[PDB]
Amino acid sequence: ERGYSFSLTTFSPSGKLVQIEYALAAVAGGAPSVGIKAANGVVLATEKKQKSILYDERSVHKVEPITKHIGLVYSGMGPDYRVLVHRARKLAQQYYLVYQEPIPTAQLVQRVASVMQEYTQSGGVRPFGVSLLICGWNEGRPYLFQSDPSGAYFAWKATAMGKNYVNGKTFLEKRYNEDLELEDAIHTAILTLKESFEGQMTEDNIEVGICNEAGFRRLTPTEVKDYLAAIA
Amino acid sequence: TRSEYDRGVNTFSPEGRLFQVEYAIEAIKLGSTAIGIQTSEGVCLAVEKRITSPLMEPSSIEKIVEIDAHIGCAMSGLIKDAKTLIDKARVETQNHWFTYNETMTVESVTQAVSNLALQFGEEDADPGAMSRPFGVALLFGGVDEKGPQLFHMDPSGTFVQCDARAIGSASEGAQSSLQEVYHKSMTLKEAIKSSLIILKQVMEEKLNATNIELATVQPGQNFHMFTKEELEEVIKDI
Amino acid sequence: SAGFDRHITIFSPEGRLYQVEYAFKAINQGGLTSVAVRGKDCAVIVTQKKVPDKLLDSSTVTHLFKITENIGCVMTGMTADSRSQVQRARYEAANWKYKYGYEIPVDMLCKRIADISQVYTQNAEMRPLGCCMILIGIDEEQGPQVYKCDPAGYYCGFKATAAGVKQTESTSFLEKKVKKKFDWTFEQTVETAITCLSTVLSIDFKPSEIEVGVVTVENPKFRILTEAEIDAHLVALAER
Amino acid sequence: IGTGYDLSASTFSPDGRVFQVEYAMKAVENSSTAIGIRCKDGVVFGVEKLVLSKLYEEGSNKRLFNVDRHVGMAVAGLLADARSLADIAREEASNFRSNFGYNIPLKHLADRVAMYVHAYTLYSAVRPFGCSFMLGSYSVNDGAQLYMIDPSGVSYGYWGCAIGKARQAAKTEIEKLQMKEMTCRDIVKEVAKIIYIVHDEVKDKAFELELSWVGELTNGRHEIVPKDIREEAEKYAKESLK
Amino acid sequence: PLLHPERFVNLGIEPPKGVLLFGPPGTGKTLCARAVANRTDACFIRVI
Amino acid sequence: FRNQYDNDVTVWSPQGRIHQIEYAMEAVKQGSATVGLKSKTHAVLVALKRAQSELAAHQKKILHVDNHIGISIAGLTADARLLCNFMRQECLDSRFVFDRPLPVSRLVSLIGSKTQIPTQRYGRRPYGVGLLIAGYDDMGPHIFQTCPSANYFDCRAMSIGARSQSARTYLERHMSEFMECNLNELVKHGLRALRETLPAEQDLTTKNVSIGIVGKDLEFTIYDDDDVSPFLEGLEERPQ
Amino acid sequence: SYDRAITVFSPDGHLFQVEYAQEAVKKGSTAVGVRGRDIVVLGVEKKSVAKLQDERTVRKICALDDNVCMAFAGLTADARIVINRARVECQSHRLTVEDPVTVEYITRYIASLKQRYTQSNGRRPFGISALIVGFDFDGTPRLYQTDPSGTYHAWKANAIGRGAKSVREFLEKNYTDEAIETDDLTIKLVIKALLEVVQSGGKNIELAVMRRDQSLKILNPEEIEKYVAEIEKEKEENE
Amino acid sequence: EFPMPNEEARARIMQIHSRKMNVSPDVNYEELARCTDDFNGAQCKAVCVEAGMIALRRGATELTHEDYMEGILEVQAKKKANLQYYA
Ligand SMILES: Nc1ncnc2c1ncn2[C@@H]1O[C@H](COP(=O)(O)OP(=O)(O)O)[C@@H](O)[C@H]1O
C-alpha cells in the first residue's frame, strides 16, 4: 500500500488514488469554515485567528467574491486558495464574455471542479490542498456547493470543513432547519465557529460573507461586531 | 554492481563500457547464422532458415533482401528492427539515385544505415525514433566502382570491410572455420561450395532446399537470389 | 509516517508538505536576521551584516534592495535565491507598470510574487526559491504597508515582522513592544528595530554592522539610510 | 551525510541546505588557486596553472580569458565548466551591447551571470556550474570593481580574493598586503609572490604562472601581462621567494 | 616450483605459499586440482 | 551502494566529483593508442589500426574532416562519428560564410562547447571519445587533444587510449627533437612511439598503422598500407 | 530488473516486455484461419454469452476492407483500436493509389503500427495477434499472421490464442493439397481444427468465408448447424 | 591523512618489498615511479610480486626493467578487454 501512496497516476490494488486522500487530509487540517444556506440567502464564515497580532488582518481576506453574486471560502492551504480564486475569476469572466449574462453558480462550480481535477490528471503536479465552499443566488434560489481537491463537487444545505469539522457538522445537523432565516443563519454560523473557536472570537478573529438576492457581500467588521454582540 | 548501468543506454560503466549496447550485440546471437564471403568474381550470401513449421510459407521468412539491384543484404536479430533498417536503406538508395542519379556505393550504404543506427541516444528522436539501440547485425554485399564489396554492420553502428564474415548464433565457430577455409583467389562457385560446407558443419539440421536461402551478386548480372532449382543444383554437389 | 520528504509535489500522510518546511528551514540557513517595523507614516527595515574579512567590498554586500522608485525590499536566506527573487520582483513590478500605467501597490506585488512562488511549489519543475521577503511602501488612502512573502507563496501584511535565525524571539519582542499601543514615530520605529536586533542578538552592535531602509509619506522614495544618518539614529539611541 | 537528499539539486536537507551546491563548493576547493587584485586604476589577475605533462604546450588550457574588451575572465573549477560559463557570459555581454549600445558594467554583468548560474542551480534536469569565476574591469567613468561568483550563485564584491585549495591560505597572506593605494606596477609583484608561495612544491609541483590585467595602462583593455613585464614579475618573484 | 626449484632458488624468490581456486560449483575446480595432482607426480588429498 | 552518485552526469559525489564524467574519461582509455607529433611546419597523426578479425579490414582511426584540419578518434564509434559529421558541417559553414578555414583553436573551442552540454544537462550521454586534432593556421601547426571530459589541451604531443602511457613516456624522453624535425624524422618518431605502445609479439605492419600528415602547403592526407610503405621503408628496426 | 522496461535489452538480449505482450495473446481465445484454392476461412471460438450479452457487438471477426478480413486474439480494446486504424489506412491507401489494398500492404501497415507502438516508453505494445486474410487483385489466396512484437509472417493456415499449439499440430497433421480442393473440404478442415479445442460444437464457433471477391458473408447460424451436421455426418462416415 | 603514494614512496616501496628479490641495478625505479600514475600502495603487490612471477612468465630471468614496465602496464588492468564497437 506504501508503493502506491507516491503518485497520482497509479491505482491502489484495493481502492483508489492515495494522494487525493492525503490532499483531503491536508484540507481537513485547515482553518474551520462553515457555510449555511437559508431560505432567502446563504452565509459562509471562517476563523482568521493567528498569533502575533503584528499580523495585519485586513491585508488578506479568506472570503472573496467571484462575481457580483458569487462568493467563496476555503479550508486548507492559503496560496492554493488564492490560485483557485484567480482561476475561478478567469473562468467566470470568460463565461460572462461569451454569454453576456451573469454566470450561474452551478456552471461555475462545475468549471472550477474541472480545473482543479485537471491538476490531478498527471504526475509531477500535486492536487490542490484546498476545498472550496461556493455561495450563490440565482433564479430565486440560494445555492451552496462544495468543491473538492479531487474535483468532486456536491451541494450542501449547511456544512463545515477544516479543523474539528465532524463536531461542527454534528452541531449543524442538530441546529439547521429548512425554514431558517438569513439572520438566524448567521447566528447559527457564528455559533458553529464558536463551539470549536478556542479563544473568544473578536470582530476580526472571524470573517463572514453573505449572499442574497442583492448579490454577495462580505460583512464589514462593524456588522460582524454587532452580530457577535447579539449572539454574545 | 553492474545493475545500475545496464538500465538505460546513457550510462557509463566504471570500465567505460556501454552495457546496453553490449546486450544488443549479444542479442545478435539469438538470430540465425548468416555467412557472406567476398571474392573477385562477386559476393555470395548464405543463411539459415530455422523453419518453425512445415506449414510455414518460406517466402515470408526473409534472411536476405535487396536494397537495390546492385547490392544485397543479410540479417540477424529482430525481424522488425531489421525491417525498419532495410526500409531506410532502400529509401536512402533511392535518395541517392535521385540526388546524384547514380548507383551509390555499398560503403556509403552502410554509412547511411549506420547513420540511422547509433542514433538511439540522439535528441533528434523528439518526433519519434529509437530510444534503444537497434538490435540487428547487418551484412551488406554487392558490386560498385571498387568491384565486389562486402561490409558487415554492427548494431552499435560500426562497419568493417570483411572478406568473409559470419553473423548469428554460430558467428564464432563459422568465423573460425572461414578463417582457414578462405583464400584470396577463391572462385565464386568454389566460394559458394565452401559457404554451404560451413553451413552444413554449423547448421543444427540437415541441409535441404528449405534450410538455406542463397544469394549472389556479380559485376555481370544484378542481384540474384537462388531459386529452388538453382538451390538444388548448388546443394546436390555438396 | 516518513519518507515523503523527497519531492515538492508529494503529499505526505496527514497532508503535510515536508519539502516546503525544509525550504522554510533553509531560509534560516543564511545565518542572518532581519526585522521590519511600521509607524503611522513610516516603515523601517534593518538587517544584520556579517563580514568574514575586510577583503570584501562592503558597498555591494547590501542585503536590502529597491524594487521600484518608491518600493523597497529586504530579504534573507540563500543570497543567490535572494537576488533571483529581487530580479523577478523588479521584472513583475516593471511589467505591472507597463500594463496598468501606475505603480504597483505593495500588497499586489506581494500577492503576485507569492502566486509565482505557489506555482513553483505546485509543480515539480522548480526548487521553490528558499528565501523569505519583506516589502515596504506607501499607498494613498491606506498609508504605509509592510508585507512578507515566503517560499510557500504565503503572503501577509505585518505591523511588524522578522526573519532569520532569531525569528521566534524577534517576533516575541515585537509583540511585547506592539502590545503597549504607542504611536511609533519614525525615529521611534527605527529605534525599536535597532533595540530588537541588539537584544535578540545580545551584541550592542557598532553602527557599521547594520543596513537600514525607510519609506515615509513625505519621502515616498525608498531611501537607504546612509552611514551618516544610521550613525545619527543609533548613536542617538545609544545616548537616548 | 544526507543520503536520499543529495541526488538532485531541487531537494532540500532536513537542516535546509542543497547539497549539490555544497558539493560544487567542495569541487572548487579541490581545484587550482587563482588570485586577483584591483589596483588604483585597474584590476589584475593571476592563475596558478599546473603542467600535468610537459607534453602539454605552454598556454594550453588558458584560464585568464576576457569576456569583453574591458572585462576579463579568471575562473577556478572545471575547464569545461569554465569554458561554458565564459561562453554564456560572452553571449550575455554581446546581447547587452546589441540591445543597449554601450559597455556592460561589471556589477550588472555579474548580476546577469549570477542569475544565469542560479538558473542551473535550482533545476533537477540540470546541474549547477561547479566552477568559481572572477569578474574584473576598469571604466574611466565608473571605476574598478572585482567580483567572485561561485556555483552557489552568490556574486559578492571582493577587493581581491582567491579560490582553490589555498583559499584560507591565500586569505592569510593577502590580508597582510596593503591594497587600495598602489597601482598595477606595484601590485603585480605582490600577486606573483603570493601565487608562488601558496603553491605546494612537495606535492602538486610543476606549475607555471600566467597573468592578465585590465586598466588604463592598456587603455581599459584586458590583456595578458606583456612578456617583458611577465619576466620582470618572475624575476621579482625569484628574488623575493629567495 | 615443484619440478623447477632451481629457478626460484637463483631468482631468490619464495615459491608461492598458498593459492585459492575460487569459482562457481561444477566448474571443475576439484577435477582440475586432481588432474594437476596426477601430472605433478604428487598424491592428491581430498578433504571434504 | 555508495556509488549511487554515478548513474547520471547531473549529480556530484560527496567529494565533489562527477563519477560519470570520470567513467567517460576512462572509456577512451579502452580504445587503441594514437600519438601525434608536429614540426615547425608539419603535424602528423599516426594511429594503430585494429581489426575485429584478421579476415576483415582494420578499423579506421584517422578521419579527414577538411583539407587543412584532420582528426583521429579513440573510443566509441558512434560518438566519434557524430563528432566527425558535426566537424565537417561546421568547417563547411565556416568556408561558406567566411571563406577562411576554421581555426584549430576555434574548432576545438566549439568542440568543447558542443560536448559540454551532455556533461551539464540530463539527456545525452557524455561524448566518450578521445580526439586528436592536428591542423594548420596562421601561427603554424597545432595539436589539440580533446579529452571526453569536455576538456581540451594544446599539446606538443599526446597518446590517448590503451597502453598510451608508454608512448607518453617515450615522447617525454624525446621532446628535444620534435620541433626541428622534418616529415620523415617526425614520422619515424611517431612510429617508434606506437611501437613502444605495441607489445613484443606484435609489430607495426602495413595493415596495422595509419598515418595522417598535415602542413603549411600539404593538405591533411592519410596514408595506407601501400601509401605508408615509403614512410616505413625509412623506418628503422625495433630495438629489441 | 530488466522486465519492467519496454526498451531495455536484457543481458541475454531479450526485450522482455515484448515477449510478455506476446504471451498475453495466449490468454485470449483460439482463432484459426485457413486459405484454400478459391476460399479463405476463419474459425474462432465464441464465448458462450451467459444470458444477456448482445452477440451483435461481440464481434471477433472483422473485415478491414472489401478485399481483406481479420480475426484477433488479445484485449478487445486493442483489437478495436487497431481495426479502426487499419481500416482508416486501407481507405487512405485507396485514396493515394486508387486500387484495392493488397493483403501484404495492410499486414505490413499493421505490423509497422504495432512496432512503432513497441519501441518507446510510455506506449504499451498492442497485445493482440491478428490473422490477416484476403485476395489480391489477381485473386491469389494469401493469409498473414501479425505478432504483437510488430512482425508479420505468411501462413497457409495458422491458429492463435489459447490452445493454438494443439491446432497448429492438428493442421500440420491434416493440411493436404487435396484438403483444399473444394470449399467444403477447406470448411471441413477448419471446423475439425476448431472442434479440436472447442469440442462442444454447435455454438461457440464463428465462421467466415471469402471467395473470389464475394465481399464475404459470415456463415450465419443456420448452416453452422447444417455445416456441423455435415461435419458429424462425415465424422461418423469415416468412423 | 594517507595521500596518494609519491614517486619516491613507490620507488622505496618496491625497493623494500623487492629487497628480498635479486633485482639487478639495470632497472630504473624512478621511471617506474613516474609511470605509476594512479598506482597506489597494495598495487606494489601486483607490480611487485606479480613482477617476480612475470620474470617467471618471462622465463625466470633477472628482475630487469622489462618485467617492471610490464607489471606497470598490467597491474590490475592486466586483463585485456579486447572489446568491439570501439573505434
Ligand atoms: N574443464 C573441464 N574439463 C573436463 N570436465 C569438466 C571440466 N569442468 C567440469 N567438468 C565436469 O564436471 C564434473 C564435476 O566437476 P567438479 O570438479 O565436481 O566441479 P567443482 O569444481 O565445483 O568441484 C566432472 O565430472 C567433470 O567431468
Side-chain angles (χ1 to χ4, degrees), chain B residues 151-163:
Chain B
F151 267 65
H152 152 265
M153 201 265 268
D154 173 335
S156 87
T158 319
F159 49 58
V160 159
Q161 186 273 332
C162 324
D163 335 1

Side-chain angles (χ1 to χ4, degrees), chain E residues 23-32:
Chain E
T27 312
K29 304 176 295 308
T30 316
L31 163 77
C32 308

Side-chain angles (χ1 to χ4, degrees), chain C residues 5-6 53 55-57 81, chain D residues 4-5 13 38 118 157 159 175:
Chain C
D5 52 315
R6 287 331 200 269
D53 194 283
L55 195 53
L56 56 99
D57 310 0
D81 290 38
Chain D
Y5 304 76
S13 89
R38 159 249 305 263
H118 188 190
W159 294 97
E175 201 192 277

Side-chain angles (χ1 to χ4, degrees), chain B residues 4-5 10-16 18 111 114-115 118 121 123 152 158-165 175 178-179, chain F residues 3 6-7 20 23-24 26-27 52-57 59 76-78 81-82 122-126 128:
Chain B
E4 300 77 340
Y5 332 101
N10 317 298
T11 43
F12 261 123
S13 85
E15 317 79 11
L18 267 284
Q111 267 256 56
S114 173
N115 163 266
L118 75 87
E123 283 323 345
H152 152 265
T158 319
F159 49 58
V160 159
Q161 186 273 332
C162 324
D163 335 1
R165 183 50 165 291
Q175 203 63 34
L178 280 182
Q179 191 37 78
Chain F
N3 67 335
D6 40 69
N7 298 330
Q20 197 81 187
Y23 303 160
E26 169 281 315
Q52 327 188 294
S53 196
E54 59 285 9
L55 172 43
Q59 257 294 94
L76 323 170
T77 291
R81 164 152 172 186
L82 287 157
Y122 179 95
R124 178 51 150 70
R125 144 171 51 71

Side-chain angles (χ1 to χ4, degrees), chain A residues 20 109-110 112-114 116-118 120 146-153:
Chain A
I20 291 274
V109 174
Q110 262 193 42
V112 71
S114 321
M116 49 203 331
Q117 84 91 23
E118 154 185 352
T120 68
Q146 162 161 0
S147 164
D148 228 21
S150 61
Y153 78 94

Side-chain angles (χ1 to χ4, degrees), chain A residues 40-67 69-173 175-194:
Chain A
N40 65 331
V42 287
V43 46
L44 18 66
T46 167
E47 55 90 13
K48 290 205 62 174
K49 151 201 299 169
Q50 70 287 70
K51 194 263 147 181
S52 156
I53 318 86
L54 331 177
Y55 279 72
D56 172 14
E57 312 87 300
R58 309 318 108 64
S59 73
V60 316
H61 298 250
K62 276 199 275 279
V63 184
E64 317 270 10
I66 303 311
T67 167
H69 72 123
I70 297 319
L72 94 168
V73 199
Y74 78 108
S75 303
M77 320 270 320
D80 290 61
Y81 168 60
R82 215 173 41 248
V83 159
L84 266 284
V85 171
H86 228 306
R87 290 297 287 103
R89 296 257 181 62
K90 154 75 191 48
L91 252 167
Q93 251 173 2
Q94 170 275 347
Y95 196 1
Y96 194 11
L97 286 186
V98 178
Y99 281 70
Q100 288 304 144
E101 183 264 343
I103 164 175
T105 192
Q107 274 58 35
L108 184 43
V109 174
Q110 262 193 42
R111 294 173 152 76
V112 71
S114 321
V115 80
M116 49 203 331
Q117 84 91 23
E118 154 185 352
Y119 283 57
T120 68
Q121 299 273 90
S122 98
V125 38
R126 99 210 202 285
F128 294 124
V130 168
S131 195
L132 301 203
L133 262 158
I134 285 299
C135 68
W137 165 268
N138 54 227
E139 279 50 21
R141 272 193 35 76
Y143 285 27
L144 173 44
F145 289 78
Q146 162 161 0
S147 164
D148 228 21
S150 61
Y153 78 94
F154 33 96
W156 266 125
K157 271 185 267 302
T159 177
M161 81 285 278
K163 185 74 52 63
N164 270 318
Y165 69 102
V166 294
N167 286 348
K169 207 164 303 162
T170 55
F171 192 42
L172 272 194
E173 74 196 324
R175 291 291 294 101
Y176 174 86
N177 59 343
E178 279 94 340
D179 303 298
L180 204 42
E181 194 28 73
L182 214 39
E183 280 87 330
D184 321 322
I186 312 147
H187 297 142
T188 47
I190 300 157
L191 287 162
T192 310
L193 267 286
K194 165 54 72 208

